[PDB]
Amino acid sequence: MGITITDELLWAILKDELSDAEANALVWQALGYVWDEAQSCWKTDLVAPEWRQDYPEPPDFIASRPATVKLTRSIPAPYKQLLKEELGFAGYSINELVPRKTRRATMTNWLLAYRRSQQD
């Protein structure tokens, strides 16, 4: 659907507050797959057809990276640095460069390009 994101929400993932199942959820709401507790399934009414087309389950960016290609479509050249050009984040230190957390920064990059594109 057309949710908003905030810099606070973005920083929460960069820090540590969001979790695996939580950080996935914030992407899944934003597209609009939006778990239908009535249907016991992911809804798709509220998501763009180019996303729901081929996606019978939501994108796990932590294990997998199929949809990382699809996010990149919506991340144009003038929006690659929005982590620093909105917030001021760039990348992590060595001591923190875990596969658990690096895979968040991919989706977080996309979250900025979405919220910014809404004001075009």
UniProtKB/TrEMBL annotation:
It comes from the Bacteria. This is DUF1823 domain-containing protein.
